[PDB]
Design a binder for this molecule. Structure first.
Ligand code: CLA
Ligand code: CLA
Ligand code: CLA
Ligand code: CLA
Ligand SMILES: CC(C)=CCC/C(C)=C/CC/C(C)=C/CC/C(C)=C/CC/C(C)=C/CC/C(C)=C/CC/C(C)=C/CC/C(C)=C/CC/C(C)=C/CC1=CC(=O)C(C)=C(C)C1=O
Ligand SMILES: CC(C)=CCC/C(C)=C/CC/C(C)=C/CC/C(C)=C/CC/C(C)=C/CC/C(C)=C/CC/C(C)=C/CC/C(C)=C/CC/C(C)=C/CC1=CC(=O)C(C)=C(C)C1=O
Ligand SMILES: CCCCCCCCCCCCCCCCCC(=O)OC[C@H](CO[C@@H]1O[C@H](CO)[C@H](O)[C@H](O)[C@H]1O)OC(=O)CCCCCCCCCCCCCCCCC
Ligand SMILES: CCCCCCCCCCCCCCCCCC(=O)OC[C@H](CO[C@@H]1O[C@H](CO)[C@H](O)[C@H](O)[C@H]1O)OC(=O)CCCCCCCCCCCCCCCCC
Ligand SMILES: CCCCCCCCCCCCCCCC(=O)OC[C@H](COP(=O)(O)OC[C@@H](O)CO)OC(=O)CCCCCCCCCCCCCCC
Ligand SMILES: CCCCCCCCCCCCCCCC(=O)OC[C@H](COP(=O)(O)OC[C@@H](O)CO)OC(=O)CCCCCCCCCCCCCCC
Ligand code: HEC
Ligand code: OEY
Ligand SMILES: [Cl-]
Ligand SMILES: [Cl-]
Ligand SMILES: [Fe+2]
Lengths: 51, 152, 32, 137, 244, 176, 36, 334, 97, 30, 51, 33
C-alpha cells in the first residue's frame, strides 16, 4: 500500500526495471529482508554514477 | 493586583533571557500570554509558607529550591533521590493560588505542585497560548535587548 | 529536524548575492 | 580565628574525661596522618569504602565508640568493623599488623595519640568539609 | 586437553560454551532421594530474530533475522542453581546466581538497532514428569524475568532519569509539558520470557549435558519511551550436573 | 582569575559555540600560523650573502636587495600546498588583516554576551532531544557539562546570591 | 573480509617498497647543485 | 634509461605542478583514504558507542547534526587501544557501531601528515633551499599526534582521543580541564603565549612593513601594484620601520636585521606550540597542572579560598557530569 | 497515570525510615550496632511482611535480637519496588561521597 | 534540506580549490 | 481479495487525476494508505443492492 | 494562507539567477568600449 510510485520516486523504478532491487541496508523492494545485494545495490549504482 | 503589574514580575519579560539566534517575537518563545493564573503560595506539611528561589538572569536552567521566610532550605526537587531529605513528597508541600484564574484553588498531589514550583522560579505564573504561533518554549529577548545589541 | 524554514532562503541569498557581486566585477575586469 | 585550647580540647575517653593538646601535637598528628592515613582518608573520607568517614558523629556510633582518644588509639592497635564484630587488622593498618603495613612499624603511643587528636580536632575547624567529600571542596 | 587463558585470550573462544562429543548419547540417572545442582550452565546464542510489526492490516508478523553489532559478548555462563526432584518425578532447575544477562544490540534491515537484555534471570525450568534419567530427549521448559535494560540511575542525553536526573525538559522552559510526559517520566519494566532447552547430548559418566535452546523475550523499551520488540533467541547450551 | 572567567563563559554563555568567538580563534591561530610560516619561509629561502655558517651577519639594514628569494619560496609553496604568495605587499597586509580582524570579531560576540545574547542552544536539537531519549550528540553532551559548571561553581563564585544548594539537587552522573 | 585484508596488505606493501627503494635509488644526488 | 629510472625521475621531478616525491608516494594514498572516509562518515555514518556503554552518539548530518555539532565519533572504549581495521569486524555494520572509521581516518592521517612533513624537506632539497621549514610544521604536527595518538595511549583508549568535529573538540577540551587543570599547567600557558604572541608579532610585522611601503602607486590603485613579482629591490624601507618602532618603545627593543627579525617570528610560535603539544603529551601520563586547592589556611585552619579554588569548583562540575552513565566506582582514574 | 515510582516512594515511610524491603545497605550505618553484620543478614533475608519479622531471622544471637529491638522504631516495610532492588542496587546504588 | 545545503556549500569550496590551484593567475617574473 | 489488488481499483492511483502545480508524491494528497476498509455494499430499504 | 513553503525560494531564484546572468553579460559588454 506504499509502493515506490506512491512516494514520488522517479529513478528508483528504472534501477529496479533492469534488476537493481535491494539496499545495502538489508531491504529489497519486493519486501524480502536480510538479502545481500552485493555491490550493485541502489547505493552502489548511485556511487558508480558519481565516480 | 492588576494583571499588567504581575506580568512585569515574570522573567520571560526580562530582556537578558534571550538568545542571539532565537528569532522573532517573545510570543514565539513562551507564548501569547492569556491570563494570570494567580499568585502561588507554597506550604509544607507543618503549615509554614515557603518561597521558591527565583531564577537569576545568568542561568539557562535553575534548580527548584524553597526556603522559609529566613532563607533556610525546606524543600527542593532533588536530582539524586536516594538520599534526598527535602523532597516535596517528604515535606508535604502544597500550593494554593490567590488572585488570577486559579484564585482559591489548592493542589496537593506532588506532581502538580512540582510543575507550579517549576514555573515559580520565573516569577508570577501565566497561562500561555503556545499553539497559535507554534511557540517552542524558549525565551527570546525584547526590542529593548535587540536595540541595545545593534547600537552597541 | 525542526529547523527554521527561512534558514534556507537566508543561506541561499547570503551566498548568492555577494558571490554574484564579485563575479560581475571580475568578468568586467577581464573584458578590458 | 586562631588555634585555641578550647579547640585543641577533645574527649580522652567515653566517660567524659578530656585532654587538651598543644599546637605542636596537632601539627604532629597532621604530619603523621598525612604520612600514614591520607592515601585513603584525605579530608576525612574513606576512598576504598566511602560509606564510612571519620566524622565525629560517625565515630560516636561505632561499636565500640571511637569519638575519643582512647577508642581511636585502640582502633589503631586493633581495628574492627563498625559494629565491632570483626577484627580487620589483616586489611587495615594497625600496630597489630605492622608486619604487612610497614608504615606502622616506626609509630609509638605518642604518635597514635597525635593522630587521634588531629582527627578529633579537624572537624571542629573545617566543619562539614571534614568527611564531606567533593561537594564541600 | 587443558587450555590456559593465554591459549584463548583474544580468539573469541571465551564466548563459546563447551561442547560434548558426537558420541555422548548416554543417560544420567537421577536418584530421587539424592539432591542435585547445576554447577555450570552456559548459553551461547547463535541467532537473534526480531518480530516485524505488521501494518494496520493485521495480516502477518514474521520473525526476521538481524545482524549482531556488539561482538563476542553475548553468552551467559557460570550459572548455578539447585536441580531438585519433584514428587511427580519431574526435575526443576532453579537459578541461584551467575553471569545470567548480556546486553545485546542487533540491527534490522533499514538500519534500526534493537537493544535487548538477553537473560535468564530467575530462571525456573522443569522437565516432563517421571524423569528417571536425563536423556538425549529430555526437554526443560521454563520462564525467567527480564528487568529493564537500563536500571534506575541511567541518565538520558538531556539528564532525565528515574532514581536520578532532571524530571523535566530543562531546555524548553515554557513548553507544554503534557506532550513530553512519556519522555520525561521514566518507567522501569519487568517482563517474563519463555525458554525451551533440548538436551541432545549427554555424558552419563561426567554428568555433562548439551543441546540447543530457544527463548523469547522483549527488547529494550528505553525506560518506557517506546514499545519494545518481540525477540526470539536460538543457540546452544552446556551444563554440568553434580550431586549436591 | 582569568581562567575562572574562561570557565564561567563556558558554563553560563556556551561561548565555544559562538560563531564570533570561532572567527576570533581562526584569526588568532591563523595569525600565529602566518607568523611561523612566513618567518620560517624567509629563513629557508635566504640568499648566500656571506661566507659564514651563521647567516644573520650577511644582512646590511641599508642594502637595496631582497635578502631572500620570493621566486623560490613561491615555487616551493605552489608545489607543496598548491598556491603561494607572489606579492610581498599583499602578504604583509594579509598579516595585519588576519589577527586584527580576528580580535574585532570576538569583541562583537562579547558585546552580545553583555546582554546574555548568547549562542547557547540549537533549537532543532533541543526539540528532538526532548522527544527522543535516544538522540545524543556532542552538543547535548556539552550542555550537561555546562549544567555541572553552573551549579557547582555558583555558590562560591557569586556569594552575594547566598545560593544554598543541598547535595540532593546537585547534578551528578553515576558514582562521580 | 579475508579478501579485503589481503588486498590491503599487498597494496600497503607495494607502496612501502616504492618508498624504500626510491630513497635507495641515489637520492642524495637528486639535487640541483652537487651531484656528489 | 630504464623504466625504474624513468619512474624515479618522475617522482622526484620539480616540474610537476604539485611535487610528488618519495614521501608523496605514501602521503597521497593515506590522505586520500582518510579524506574520503572522513567525508562519507561525517555525512552518513550511523551513531557510534564512543564510551562502550551501548549509548550511541550520533555524529553525522543525516542522523540529525549540523556542521557545528557533527563529528566522526571516537571508537568504543570496549576496544581500548586494540587495532580495529574493517577486516576484524564481523560486518561493516559492526565496524560502524563501534567507531571503526575514527581509527581508519586518524591512522591514515597521522601517517600522511608525517609524510607531508617529510615532503616539505624533500622539495627544499630539490630546490636548493635551506631545510628547516619542515621543522616549523613539526609544531602543528606534534600537537595533532598529542590529541589523536599520545593522549589515547596514556589513557588506554582511543575513546578519549579528540573527536573529529567542532563540538566534539569542545567536549574534549572541557573534559581535559576537569581531569588535568591544563589551564593551571605551565606548558599550556606557554602555548597561549605562543599563539597570542604569534598573532601579535604577525599583526606587528604586517602593520610595520605595510606602514613603510615605498610610494610606487597613485591614490586610485591598490598599493599592492607597487611590488612586482621577482623584483630585486625591497618594497619597504626597513630603516623607516625601525625608526618608527624604535621610537615607539626604544631603539634596541626593535630589530635592525631582517634575518634576526624573521627567525624571531618563526621561533616564537613554533616553540610555544611545541610546549603546548608537550603539555598534552605529558598530561597523557597524568602529570597535571598545578594544584593549589586549599593551599591557603588561616590561623585556626579554616580554608581561605583563592581563585584556584573557584576554578576547582568549575572543574568539579565538569568531572561529575561528563560521561554521566560510564562510571561505577568513585574515582575516574583514566 | 505516568508517575515516577521512586518519587512516589519518598512520600511513604521509605522517606522517613529504613525500609527493610527497599533501602540501600549503607543507611544501616545510621544507627549503632547494625553495620555490617546485621545489615547483611537483613538485606539477604529478602523481603519481610512486617518490621517485626526481622527478629525471626535464623541465627541471631540474643545480643542481635536486642539491637534489632532497640531499632525497630527506625525501620519500616513497604512493598518491594523493582527499580530500587534490581541491579544489586541495595548493595551499591551508585552513590558514594 | 539542511543536509543538502551543508553538503552543497562544502562541495562548492572543493571546486573553488581546484580552480584556485590549477586555474590560478600564473606568477611571472617582470 | 488481496489488498494490493483492491488498491489498484481506486482512482487516487489513476495518473489522470492530478494537477500541474499539485507537487510531490501522491501520498501528500490523499495520504499514506494504511489498510483496505473493505468492500462497501449499499442496499435500499427493500434489500436491493445498489451501485 | 497555507501556501507552499518553497514557493518563496523558487521565486527568488527564478528572478535572481537569470537576471544576474544578464547583468554579468551587460556590464562586461559596457567596459569593452
Ligand atoms: C537597528 C536594527 C534593528 C533592530 C534592533 C531590529 C529588531 C527587531 N526586528 Mg527588525 N529589521 C531591521 C533592523 C532592525 N530590527 C531591518 C533593517 C530589517 C529589514 C531587513 C528588519 C526586518 C525585520 C523583519 C522582517 C522582522 C524583524 C523583527 C524584529 C524583531 C526580532 C529580531 C530578530 O529575531 O533578530 C534576529 C537577528 C539575528 C539572527 C542576528 C543576525 C546577525 C548575523 C550574525 C550577521 C552578522 C555576521 C557577518 C556576516 C560577519 C562578517 C564578518 C566579516 C566582516 C569579516 C526585533 C525587535 C521580526 C519581528 O518580530 O517583527 C515583527 C520580523 O519578523 N525585523
Ligand atoms: C583554541 C583555543 C582558543 C583560542 C585560540 C582563543 C582565542 C581567543 N579567545 Mg577564547 N576561549 C577558549 C579557547 C580559545 N580562545 C575556550 C575553550 C574558552 C572557554 C569558553 C574561551 C573563553 C574565552 C573568553 C571568556 C574570552 C576569550 C577571548 C579570546 C580572544 C582573546 C584575544 C586576546 O589576545 O586577548 C588579550 C587581551 C587583549 C588583547 C586586551 C588588552 C591588551 C593590552 C595591549 C595589554 C597591555 C599590557 C601591558 C604591556 C602591561 C603588561 C603587564 C605585565 C607585566 C603583567 C581570542 C580570540 C576573549 C575575547 O573574545 O575578547 C573579546 C574573552 O574575553 N576566550
Ligand atoms: C583564551 C583562551 C585560550 C587560548 C588562547 C588557548 C590556546 C590554546 N589551547 Mg587551550 N583551553 C582553554 C583556553 C584557551 N586555550 C580553555 C578554557 C580550556 C579548557 C576548557 C582549554 C583546553 C585546551 C586543550 C585540552 C587543548 C588546548 C590547546 C590549545 C592550543 C590550540 C592550538 C593548537 O593546538 O595548535 C597546534 C596546531 C594544530 C593542532 C593543527 C595541526 C594541523 C595538522 C598537522 C594538519 C591539519 C590539516 C587539515 C585537516 C586540513 C587543512 C588543509 C585544507 C585547506 C584542505 C593553543 C595553544 C590544545 C593543545 O595544546 O594541543 C597541543 C589542546 O589539546 N586547550
Ligand atoms: C523528466 C524530468 C523529471 C520528472 C518527470 C520528475 C518527476 C518527479 N519528481 Mg524529480 N527532478 C528532476 C526531474 C524530473 N523529476 C530534476 C532535473 C531534478 C533536479 C532539479 C528533480 C528533483 C526532484 C526533487 C527534489 C523532488 C522531485 C520529485 C518528483 C515527483 C514530483 C514532481 C513534481 O511535483 O513536479 C512539479 C512540476 C512542476 C511544478 C512544473 C514546473 C515547471 C514550470 C511550469 C516550467 C517553467 C516555465 C518556463 C520559464 C516557461 C517560459 C519560457 C519561455 C517563454 C521562453 C515526480 C515523480 C519530488 C518527490 O516526490 O521526490 C520523491 C521531490 O521532492 N524531483
Ligand atoms: C562534509 C562536510 C560538510 C564536512 C565539513 C567539515 C567541517 C567541520 C567543516 C567546517 C569548516 C568550518 C566551519 C570552519 C570555518 C572556521 C571559521 C570560524 C572561519 C573563520 C572565518 C573568518 C572570516 C574569521 C575572521 C578572521 C580571519 C580573517 C581568519 C583568516 C585565517 C587564515 C586564512 C589564515 C591564513 C591560513 C594559511 C593556510 C595561510 C597560508 C599562506 C601561504 C600559502 C603562505 C606561504 C608563503 C609564505 C611566505 O613567507 C612567502 C614568502 C611565500 C611566497 C609563501 O607562499
Ligand atoms: C605626573 C606625570 C608622571 C606626568 C608627566 C608626563 C611625562 C612627561 C612624564 C615624564 C616621562 C617619563 C619617561 C616618565 C617615566 C614614567 C614611566 C616609568 C612610565 C611607565 C610606563 C610603562 C609602564 C610602560 C609599559 C612598557 C611596555 C610598553 C612594555 C614593554 C614592551 C616591550 C619592551 C616590547 C618588546 C616586544 C618585542 C619582542 C618586539 C618585537 C615585536 C615584533 C616581533 C615586531 C616586528 C618588527 C619589528 C621591527 O623592529 C621591524 C623593523 C619590523 C619590520 C617588524 O616587522
Ligand atoms: C542582501 C540580501 C540579503 C542578505 C542575505 C540574507 C542574509 C540574512 C542574514 C541574517 C540572517 C537572518 C536570520 C536567519 C533568518 C531568520 O529566521 O530570521 C527570521 C527573523 C524573524 O523571525 C521569524 O519571525 C516569524 C514571525 O515574525 C516567526 O517568529 C518565525 O519563527 C521566525 O523565523 O527575521 C528577522 O527577525 C530578521 C532580523 C533582522 C534584523 C536584526 C537586527 C539585529 C542585527 C544587528 C547586528 C548587526 C551586526 C553585524 C555584525 C558585523
Ligand atoms: C579515483 C577513484 C577513487 C575515488 C572513488 C571513491 C571511493 C568511494 C568509497 C566507498 C567505499 C564504501 C563501499 C562499501 C561497500 C559496502 C558493501 C556492503 O554491503 O556494506 C554496506 C553496509 C553498510 O552499512 C549500512 O549502510 C546502509 C546504506 O543505506 C544504511 O545506512 C545502514 O543503516 C548502514 O548500517 O553493510 C553491509 O551491507 C555489508 C557487511 C560487510 C561485508 C562486505 C565486505 C566488503 C568490505 C568493503 C570495504 C570497502 C573499502 C573501500 C575501499 C575502496 C577504495 C577505492
Ligand atoms: C628547549 C627549548 C627549545 C630549544 C630549541 C629551539 C631552537 C629554535 C627553533 C627553531 C624553529 C624555527 C623554524 C626554523 C627557522 C630557521 O630556519 O632558523 C634558522 C636560524 C638561523 O640559521 P643559520 O643556518 O644562520 O644557523 C643555524 C645553524 O646553521 C648555525 O649556523 O637558526 C638559528 O638561529 C638557530 C639558533 C639555535 C640556538 C639555540
Ligand atoms: C598535495 C598537497 C595538498 C594540497 C591540497 C590542499 C590545498 C587547497 C588550498 C587552496 C585554497 C584556495 C586558495 C584560494 C585563494 C587564493 O588563490 O589565494 C592566492 C593568493 C596568492 O596571492 P598573491 O600574493 O598572488 O596575491 C596578489 C593578489 O593579492 C593581487 O591582489 O594566496 C593567498 O592570498 C594566500 C593566503 C590565503 C590562504 C588561503 C588558505 C585557505 C585554506 C582554508 C580553506 C578551508 C575551508 C575548508 C572548509 C571545508
Ligand atoms: C586504605 C589502605 C586505608 C588506610 C591507608 C587507612 N585506612 Fe582507615 N579505613 C579504611 C577502610 C577500608 C575502613 C573501613 C573498614 C571497615 O570495613 O569497617 C577504614 C575505617 C577507619 C576507621 C573507622 C571509621 C568509622 O567507624 O567512622 C578509622 C578510625 C580509621 N579507618 C582510621 C585510620 C587511620 C588512623 C589511618 C592511619 C594510620 C588509616 N585509617 C589508614 C582504609 C584505610
Ligand atoms: O574523562 Mn573521565 O577519565 Ca578520560 O575516561 Mn575516565 O572518564 Mn572517561 O571516557 Mn572519555 O573521560
Ligand atoms: Cl562527556
Ligand atoms: Cl568506573
Ligand atoms: Fe616579512
Amino acid at each position: 500500500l506504499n509502493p515506490m510510485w506512491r512516494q514520488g520516486m522517479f529513478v528508483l523504478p528504472f534501477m529496479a526495471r533492469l534488476g537493481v532491487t535491494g539496499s545495502w541496508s538489508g531491504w529489497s523492494i519486493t519486501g524480502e529482508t536480510g538479502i545481500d545485494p552485493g555491490f550493485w545495490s541502489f547505493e552502489g549504482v548511485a556511487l558508480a554514477h558519481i565516480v | 493586583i492588576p494583571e499588567k503589574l504581575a506580568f512585569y514580575d515574570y522573567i520571560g519579560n526580562n530582556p537578558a533571557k534571550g538568545g542571539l539566534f532565537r528569532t522573532g517575537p517573545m510570543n514565539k518563545g513562551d507564548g501569547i500570554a492569556q491570563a494570570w493564573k494567580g499568585h502561588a503560595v507554597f506550604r509544607n506539611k507543618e503549615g509554614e509558607e515557603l518561597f521558591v528561589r527565583r531564577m537569576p538572569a545568568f542561568f539557562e536552567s535553575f534548580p527548584v529550591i524553597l526556603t522559609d521566610k529566613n532563607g533556610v532550605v525546606k524543600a527542593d526537587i532533588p536530582f539524586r533521590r536516594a538520599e534526598s531529605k527535602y523532597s516535596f513528597e517528604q515535606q508535604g508541600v502544597t500550593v494554593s493560588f490567590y488572585g488570577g484564574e486559579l484564585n482559591g484553588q489548592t493542589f496537593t498531589d506532588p506532581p502538580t505542585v512540582k510543575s507550579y514550583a517549576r514555573k515559580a522560579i520565573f516569577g508570577e505564573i501565566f497561562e500561555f497560548d503556545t499553539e497559535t504561533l507554534n511557540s517552542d518554549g524558549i525565551f527570546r529577548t525584547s526590542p529593548r535587548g535587540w536595540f541595545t545589541f545593534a547600537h552597541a | 529536524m525542526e529547523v527554521n524554514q527561512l534558514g534556507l532562503i537566508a543561506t541561499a541569498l547570503f551566498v548568492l548575492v555577494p558571490s554574484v557581486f564579485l563575479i560581475i566585477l571580475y568578468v568586467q575586469t577581464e573584458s578590458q | 580565628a586562631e588555634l585555641t585550647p578550647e579547640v585543641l580540647t577533645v574527649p580522652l575517653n567515653s566517660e567524659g574525661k578530656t585532654i587538651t593538646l598543644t599546637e605542636k601535637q596537632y601539627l604532629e598528628g597532621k604530619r603523621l596522618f598525612q604520612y600514614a592515613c591520607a592515601s585513603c582518608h584525605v579530608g576525612g573520607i574513606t576512598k576504598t569504602n566511602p560509606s564510612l568517614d571519620l566524622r565525629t558523629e560517625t565515630l560516636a556510633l561505632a561499636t565500640p565508640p571511637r569519638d575519643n582518644i582512647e577508642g581511636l588509639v585502640d582502633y589503631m592497635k586493633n581495628p574492627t568493623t563498625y559494629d565491632g564484630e570483626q577484627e580487620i587488622a589483616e586489611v587495615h593498618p594497625s600496630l597489630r599488623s605492622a608486619d604487612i603495613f610497614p608504615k606502622m612499624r616506626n609509630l609509638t603511643e605518642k604518635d597514635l595519640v597525635a593522630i587521634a587528636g588531629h582527627i578529633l580536632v579537624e572537624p571542629k575547624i573545617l566543619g562539614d568539609k571534614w568527611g564531606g567529600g567533593k561537594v564541600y571542596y | 586437553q587443558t587450555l590456559t587463558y593465554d591459549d584463548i585470550v583474544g580468539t573469541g573462544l571465551a564466548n563459546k560454551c563447551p561442547t560434548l562429543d558426537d558420541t555422548a548419547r548416554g543417560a544420567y540417572p537421577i536418584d530421587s532421594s539424592q539432591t542435585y545442582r547445576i554447577a555450570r550452565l552456559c548459553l551461547q546464542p547463535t541467532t537473534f530474530l526480531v518480530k516485524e510489526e505488521p501494518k494496520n492490516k493485521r495480516q502477518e508478523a514474521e520473525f526476521v533475522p538481524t545482524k549482531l553489532v556488539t561482538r563476542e559478548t553475548t553468552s551467559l555462563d557460570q550459572i548455578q542453581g539447585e536441580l531438585k526432584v519433584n514428587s511427580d518425578g519431574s526435575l526443576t532447575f532453579v537459578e541461584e546466581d551467575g553471569i545470567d544477562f548480556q546486553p545485546v544490540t542487533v540491527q534490522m534491515a533499514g538500519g534500526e538497532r534493537i537493544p535487548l537484555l538477553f537473560t535468564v534471570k530467575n530462571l525456573v525450568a522443569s522437565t516432563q514428569p517421571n524423569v528417571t534419567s536425563i536423556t538425549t530427549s529430555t526437554d526443560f521448559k521454563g520462564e525467567f524475568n527480564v528487568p529493564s535494560y537500563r536500571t534506575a540511575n541511567f541518565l538520558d542525553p538531556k539528564g532525565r532519569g528515574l532514581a536520578s536526573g532532571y524530571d523535566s525538559a530543562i531546555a524548553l522552559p515554557q513548553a507544554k509539558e503534557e506532550e513530553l510526559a512519556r519522555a520525561n517520566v521514566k518507567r522501569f519494566s519487568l517482563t517474563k520470557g519463555q525458554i525451551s532447552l533440548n538436551v541432545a547430548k549427554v555424558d552419563g559418566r561426567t554428568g555433562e549435558i548439551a543441546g540447543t535452546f530457544e527463548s523469547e523475550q522483549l527488547s529494550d523499551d528505553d525506560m518506557g519511551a517506546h514499545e519494545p520488540h518481540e525477540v526470539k533467541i536460538q543457540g546452544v547450551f552446556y551444563a554440568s550436573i553434580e550431586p549436591a | 582569575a582569568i581562567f575562572r572567567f574562561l570557565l564561567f563563559f563556558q558554563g553560563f554563555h556556551n561561548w565555544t559555540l559562538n560563531p564570533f568567538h570561532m572567527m576570533g580563534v581562526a584569526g588568532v591561530l591563523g595569525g600565529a600560523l602566518l607568523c611561523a610560516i612566513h618567518g620560517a619561509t624567509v629563513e629557508n629561502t635566504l640568499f648566500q650573502d656571506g661566507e659564514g655558517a651563521s647567516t644573520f651577519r650577511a644582512f646590511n639594514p641599508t642594502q637595496a636587495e631582497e635578502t631572500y628569494s620570493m621566486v623560490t619560496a613561491n615555487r616551493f609553496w605552489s608545489q607543496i600546498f598548491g598556491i603561494a604568495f607572489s606579492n610581498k605587499r599583499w602578504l604583509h597586509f594579509f598579516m595585519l588583516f588576519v589577527p586584527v580582524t580576528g580580535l574585532w570579531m570576538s569583541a562583537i560576540g562579547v558585546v552580545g554576551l553583555a546582554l546574555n545574547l548568547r549562542s547557547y542552544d540549537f533549537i532543532s536539537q533541543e526539540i528532538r532531544a526532548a522527544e527522543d531519549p535516544e538522540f545524543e550528540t556532542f552538543y547535548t553532551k556539552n550542555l550537561l557539562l555546562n549544567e555541572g559548571i553552573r551549579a557547582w561553581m555558583a555558590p562560591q563564585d557569586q556569594p552575594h546570591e547566598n545560593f544554598v544548594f543541598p547535595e540532593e539537587v546537585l547534578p551528578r552522573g553515576n558514582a562521580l | 573480509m579475508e579478501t579485503l585484508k589481503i588486498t590491503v596488505y599487498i597494496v600497503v606493501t607495494f607502496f612501502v617498497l616504492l618508498f624504500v627503494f626510491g630513497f635507495l635509488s641515489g637520492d642524495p644526488a637528486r639535487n640541483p647543485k652537487r651531484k656528489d | 634509461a630504464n623504466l625504474w629510472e624513468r619512474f624515479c625521475n618522475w617522482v622526484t621531478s620539480t616540474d610537476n605542478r604539485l611535487y610528488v616525491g618519495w614521501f608523496g608516494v605514501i602521503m597521497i594514498p593515506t590522505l586520500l583514504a582518510a579524506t574520503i572516509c572522513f567525508v562519507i562518515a561525517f555525512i552518513a555514518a550511523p551513531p557510534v558507542d564512543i564510551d562502550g556503554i551501548r549509548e550511541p552518539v550520533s555524529g553525522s548530518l543525516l542522523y540529525g547534526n549540523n556542521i557545528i555539532t557533527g563529528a566522526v565519533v571516537p571508537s568504543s572504549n570496549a576496544i581500548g587501544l586494540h587495532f580495529y581495521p574493517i577486516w576484524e569486524a564481523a560486518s561493516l555494520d559492526e565496524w560502524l557501531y563501534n567507531g571503526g572509521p575514527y581509527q581508519l581516518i586518524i591512522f591514515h592521517f597521522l601517517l600522511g601528515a608525517s609524510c607531508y612533513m617529510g615532503r616539505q624537506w624533500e622539495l627544499s632539497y630539490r630546490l636548493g633551499m635551506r631545510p628547516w621549514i619542515c621543522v616549523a610544521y613539526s609544531a602543528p604536527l606534534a600537537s595533532a599526534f598529542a590529541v589523536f595518538l599520545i593522549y589515547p595511549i596514556g589513557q588506554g583508549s582511543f575513546s578519549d582521543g579528540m573527536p573529529l568535529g567542532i563540538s566534539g573538540t569542545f567536549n574534549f577540551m572541557i573534559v581535559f580541564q576537569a581531569e588535568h587543570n591544563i589551564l593551571m599547567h605551565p606548558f599550556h600557558q606557554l602555548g597561549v603565549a605562543g599563539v597570542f604572541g604569534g598573532a601579535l608579532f604577525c599583526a606587528m610585522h604586517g602593520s610595520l612593513v605595510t606602514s613603510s611601503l615605498i610610494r610606487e602607486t597613485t591614490e586610485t590603485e591598490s598599493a599592492n601594484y607597487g611590488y612586482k613579482f621577482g623584483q630585486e629591490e625591497e618594497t619597504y624601507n626597513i630603516v623607516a620601520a625601525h625608526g618608527y618602532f624604535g621610537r615607539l618603545i626604544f631603539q634596541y627593543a626593535s630589530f635592525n636585521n631582517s634575518r634576526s627579525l624573521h627567525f624571531f617570528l618563526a621561533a616564537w610560535p613554533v616553540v610555544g606550540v611545541w610546549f603546548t603539544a608537550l603539555g598534552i603529551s605529558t598530561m597523557a601520563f597524568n602529570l597535571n597542572g598545578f594544584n593549589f586547592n586549599h593551599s591557603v589556611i588561616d590561623a585556626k585552619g579554616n580554608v581561605i579560598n583563592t581563585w584556584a579554588d573557584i576554578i576547582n569548583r568549575a572543574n568539579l562540575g565538569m568531572e561529575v557530569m561528563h560521561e554521566r552513565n560510564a562510571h561505577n566506582f568513585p574515582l575516574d582514574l583514566a | 497515570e505516568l508517575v515516577n515510582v521512586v518519587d512516589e516512594k519518598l512520600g511513604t515511610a521509605y522517606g522517613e525510615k529504613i525500609d527493610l524491603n527497599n533501602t540501600n545497605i549503607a543507611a544501616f550505618i545510621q544507627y549503632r550496632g547494625l553495620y555490617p553484620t546485621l545489615a547483611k543478614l537483613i538485606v539477604k533475608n529478602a523481603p519481610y511482611e512486617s518490621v517485626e519479622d526481622v527478629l525471626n531471622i535464623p541465627g541471631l544471637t540474643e545480643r542481635q535480637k536486642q539491637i534489632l529491638r532497640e531499632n525497630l522504631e527506625h525501620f519500616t516495610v513497604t512493598e518491594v519496588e523493582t527499580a530500587l532492588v534490581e541491579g544489586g542496587d541495595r548493595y551499591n546504588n551508585g552513590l558514594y561521597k | 534540506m539542511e543536509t543538502i545545503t551543508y553538503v552543497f556549500i562544502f562541495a562548492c569550496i572543493i571546486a573553488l580549490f581546484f580552480f584556485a590551484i590549477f586555474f590560478r593567475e600564473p606568477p611571472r617574473i617582470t
